[PDB]
Motif scaffolding. Sequence first.
Motif, PDB file in Angstrom:
ATOM      1  N   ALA A 396       0.844  -1.188   0.000  1.00 31.48           N
ATOM      2  CA  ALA A 396       0.000   0.000   0.000  1.00 31.48           C
ATOM      3  C   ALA A 396       0.883   1.243   0.000  1.00 31.48           C
ATOM      4  O   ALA A 396       1.648   1.469   0.944  1.00 31.48           O
ATOM      5  N   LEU A 397       0.793   2.036  -1.064  1.00 35.01           N
ATOM      6  CA  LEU A 397       1.602   3.235  -1.216  1.00 35.01           C
ATOM      7  C   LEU A 397       0.792   4.465  -0.807  1.00 35.01           C
ATOM      8  O   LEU A 397      -0.360   4.367  -0.374  1.00 35.01           O
ATOM      9  N   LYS A 398       1.416   5.641  -0.940  1.00 31.66           N
ATOM     10  CA  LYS A 398       0.710   6.890  -0.665  1.00 31.66           C
ATOM     11  C   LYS A 398      -0.528   7.017  -1.540  1.00 31.66           C
ATOM     12  O   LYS A 398      -1.636   7.243  -1.040  1.00 31.66           O
ATOM     13  N   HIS A 399      -0.360   6.863  -2.849  1.00 28.71           N
ATOM     14  CA  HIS A 399      -1.462   6.895  -3.803  1.00 28.71           C
ATOM     15  C   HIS A 399      -1.614   5.496  -4.388  1.00 28.71           C
ATOM     16  O   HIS A 399      -0.742   5.029  -5.131  1.00 28.71           O
ATOM     17  N   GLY A 400      -2.708   4.820  -4.031  1.00 25.56           N
ATOM     18  CA  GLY A 400      -3.020   3.521  -4.594  1.00 25.56           C
ATOM     19  C   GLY A 400      -2.134   2.403  -4.073  1.00 25.56           C
ATOM     20  O   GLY A 400      -1.274   2.581  -3.209  1.00 25.56           O
ATOM     21  N   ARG A 401      -2.396   1.220  -4.634  1.00 20.38           N
ATOM     22  CA  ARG A 401      -1.678  -0.030  -4.369  1.00 20.38           C
ATOM     23  C   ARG A 401      -0.464  -0.187  -5.294  1.00 20.38           C
ATOM     24  O   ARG A 401      -0.313   0.571  -6.253  1.00 20.38           O
ATOM     25  N   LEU A 402       0.395  -1.164  -5.009  1.00 19.06           N
ATOM     26  CA  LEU A 402       1.590  -1.387  -5.816  1.00 19.06           C
ATOM     27  C   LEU A 402       1.279  -2.138  -7.104  1.00 19.06           C
ATOM     28  O   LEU A 402       1.755  -1.759  -8.179  1.00 19.06           O
ATOM     29  N   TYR A 403       0.481  -3.205  -7.014  1.00 17.90           N
ATOM     30  CA  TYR A 403       0.177  -4.024  -8.182  1.00 17.90           C
ATOM     31  C   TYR A 403      -0.653  -3.271  -9.221  1.00 17.90           C
ATOM     32  O   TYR A 403      -1.142  -3.875 -10.181  1.00 17.90           O
ATOM     33  N   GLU A 404      -0.828  -1.961  -9.046  1.00 18.08           N
ATOM     34  CA  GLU A 404      -1.489  -1.146 -10.055  1.00 18.08           C
ATOM     35  C   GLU A 404      -0.513  -0.504 -11.028  1.00 18.08           C
ATOM     36  O   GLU A 404      -0.929  -0.087 -12.114  1.00 18.08           O
ATOM     37  N   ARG A 405       0.767  -0.422 -10.671  1.00 20.38           N
ATOM     38  CA  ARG A 405       1.790   0.157 -11.531  1.00 20.38           C
ATOM     39  C   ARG A 405       2.459  -0.870 -12.434  1.00 20.38           C
ATOM     40  O   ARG A 405       3.284  -0.490 -13.273  1.00 20.38           O
ATOM     41  N   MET A 406       2.128  -2.150 -12.286  1.00 18.80           N
ATOM     42  CA  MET A 406       2.882  -3.226 -12.911  1.00 18.80           C
ATOM     43  C   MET A 406       2.161  -3.836 -14.104  1.00 18.80           C
ATOM     44  O   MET A 406       2.570  -4.900 -14.581  1.00 18.80           O
ATOM     45  N   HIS A 407       1.111  -3.181 -14.606  1.00 23.84           N
ATOM     46  CA  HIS A 407       0.254  -3.800 -15.612  1.00 23.84           C
ATOM     47  C   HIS A 407       1.014  -4.079 -16.903  1.00 23.84           C
ATOM     48  O   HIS A 407       0.896  -5.164 -17.485  1.00 23.84           O
ATOM     49  N   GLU A 408       1.806  -3.116 -17.364  1.00 28.55           N
ATOM     50  CA  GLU A 408       2.468  -3.233 -18.654  1.00 28.55           C
ATOM     51  C   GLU A 408       3.698  -4.149 -18.616  1.00 28.55           C
ATOM     52  O   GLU A 408       4.473  -4.171 -19.580  1.00 28.55           O
ATOM     53  N   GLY A 409       3.878  -4.906 -17.535  1.00 27.38           N
ATOM     54  CA  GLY A 409       4.906  -5.930 -17.478  1.00 27.38           C
ATOM     55  C   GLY A 409       6.320  -5.405 -17.530  1.00 27.38           C
ATOM     56  O   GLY A 409       7.230  -6.130 -17.948  1.00 27.38           O
ATOM     57  N   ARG A 410       6.532  -4.163 -17.119  1.00 25.51           N
ATOM     58  CA  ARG A 410       7.847  -3.549 -17.157  1.00 25.51           C
ATOM     59  C   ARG A 410       8.533  -3.706 -15.806  1.00 25.51           C
ATOM     60  O   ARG A 410       7.881  -3.909 -14.778  1.00 25.51           O
TER      61      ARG A 410
END
Length: 474
Positions: A396-410
Motif C-alpha cells: 500500500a503506497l501513498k497513492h493507490g496499491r503497488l500491483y497497479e503500476r505493474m500492468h504493462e509488465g515492465r
Amino acid sequence: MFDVIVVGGGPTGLMLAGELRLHGVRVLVLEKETEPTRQSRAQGLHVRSIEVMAQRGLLERFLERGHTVAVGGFFAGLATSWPERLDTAHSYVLAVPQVITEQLLAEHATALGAEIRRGRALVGLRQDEDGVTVDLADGEQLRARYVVGCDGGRSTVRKLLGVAFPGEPSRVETLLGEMEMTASQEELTSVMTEVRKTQQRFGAMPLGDGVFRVVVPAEGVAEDRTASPTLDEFKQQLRAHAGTDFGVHSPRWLSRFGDATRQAERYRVDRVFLAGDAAHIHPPTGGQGLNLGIQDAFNLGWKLAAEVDGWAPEGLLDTYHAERHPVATEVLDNTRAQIQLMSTEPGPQAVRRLMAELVEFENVNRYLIEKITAISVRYDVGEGHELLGRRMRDLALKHGRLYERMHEGRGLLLDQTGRLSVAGWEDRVDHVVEVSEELDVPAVLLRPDGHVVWAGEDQQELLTRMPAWFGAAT
Ligand SMILES: Cc1cc2nc3c(=O)[nH]c(=O)nc-3n(C[C@H](O)[C@H](O)[C@H](O)COP(=O)(O)OP(=O)(O)OC[C@H]3O[C@@H](n4cnc5c(N)ncnc54)[C@H](O)[C@@H]3O)c2cc1C
Ligand SMILES: [Cl-]
Ligand SMILES: [Cl-]
Ligand SMILES: [Cl-]
Ligand SMILES: [Cl-]
C-alpha cells in the motif's frame, strides 16, 4: 512467420500468450481441441496466482465470476484455520472453475492481439539456428524464433524433443465426477463429515448447479488410462468406502485420475521450451497444478520477450529452467506427502495424527499455507538483502496499491527517497517514487514478475544489479 508459437490453449499457454503481447510479440496459440472442454478440472487460484492476476489487472474480472474462500484444510485435508499472518495482501483462496479461467485468459490474450487457432494439432517439429519449424496434422508448416510447449501431461512437444519424464508412476487411483444423488442434503453432510475421519480423499462439493462434485477412492490401478468409470463402478466405490451409493440420478461426467509424480528433465532445448503440465504432472492435492503453470508462464513471457526484443542478458533464458524446476520438484514432493498422509494404513495414519498435532502451531500452519500457495517461492538471484529472490507483496503506497503500476509488465524500481534514477534503462524499467509504511528498506528493484533483485539505498550499488537482469543501457 511468428516470433513465438505456443502449443496449447489451456491456462498456461494463454497466460504466456498475454505475457508476451505486453511487449509486442507475434504470438500464435495452437490448440488441438476445437471446442474447449466443459469438464471443470481445477477449481480456483491460490494466493500467488491471485497476486499474479492483480499485477496485470485481470483480478477484477476473476472476482466477478468466482468467490473467495478463507478456510483451512488444504494440506492433506487437515482441517484447520486460515492463518492470520500470511505475508500478503491477498490472503484468500479464489474459487473459479478452470473453464472460466481459460475463458478470461483467452478473451484477454485475444484482446491483446494474439492469434489463437483452434483445431490445429502439432504433429512434428524441428529447429535450426534461426528458428523452429512446426508440422501439423493438416499439413501446414509454421516458422517461429521460439516454440513453447504448454500442451498438458501427455505433451507432444516434450516427446518430440526426447526430454525424459522421470519420477514415480501412478499407484493410487481415485474417482471423480459431477452428478446428482438420491439423498437428502442432510444425508450427505452427515455421512461425509463422519467417514472422513478414516478416508480423507472423499467428499462432496455442491457448486450451485444443483448437482455435486463427488470424489471417491478406487480399487487397483487402471491400465487403460482412458477408460471412463461406469456409474456402477462409481457406485460400488461409494458403497465400499461410505456405505451408500447415494443413488446417482445422473452424471454430467466421470473421470479417473492417478497420483503419478513426473517432471520433465529439461525445461529448455535451445529455442523450444516447456511450461505447465507439459513439464510437470502431479496429484491435484493442494490445488497447485493450475497455479504452477500460470506462474511458469509468468516466469517466461517477460524473459522470452526480453530476447525477441534484443535486450535480454546472456543467460536470462537459461534461468527459466534454473528457477522453475526446483519449484516443481518441491510441489511434486508435498503432493507425494499429502497423498501419503491420506493413506489408510496404520503407519501413514499415525504420521497424520502427528501432523494434526503440529498444524495446531500457528507458525506450522502458516508454513504450509505459504507452501501450497507458493507465496514463499524464492529464486537464487544473488547474495545481498533478505528480500532478494522473493516476490514483493501488494504494498500500500501513498497513492493507490503497488500491483497497479505493474500492468504493462515492465521492470519496477520502487523508490522512497527520490535520489535514485535509472539512466539508460528508461526503455525497460519504470521509476515509481511513493511512500509505504510496509517497506522498511528505502528502495526495491523488482523484475516484471515481482521478484526482487536489489533492495537498498545506494545508486552505485544499484548500477551493478540493474544490467544483470535488464540488459545494457542505451
Ligand atoms: C481430476 C483433476 C483435478 C484437478 N484439480 C485441480 C485443482 O483443484 N487446482 C489446480 O490448480 N489444478 C488442478 N488440476 C490440474 C489442472 O487441470 C492442470 O494443471 C491445468 O490444466 C494446467 O494448465 P495446462 O494448460 O498446462 O493443462 P492442459 O489443460 O492439459 O493444456 C493442454 C492443452 O493443449 C492441447 N494439446 C495437447 N496436445 C496438443 C498438440 N500436439 N497440439 C496442439 N494442442 C495440443 C490440449 O488438447 C489442451 O487443450 C486437476 C487435474 C485433474 C485431472
Ligand atoms: Cl484487455
Ligand atoms: Cl514423454
Ligand atoms: Cl490408535
Ligand atoms: Cl498441540
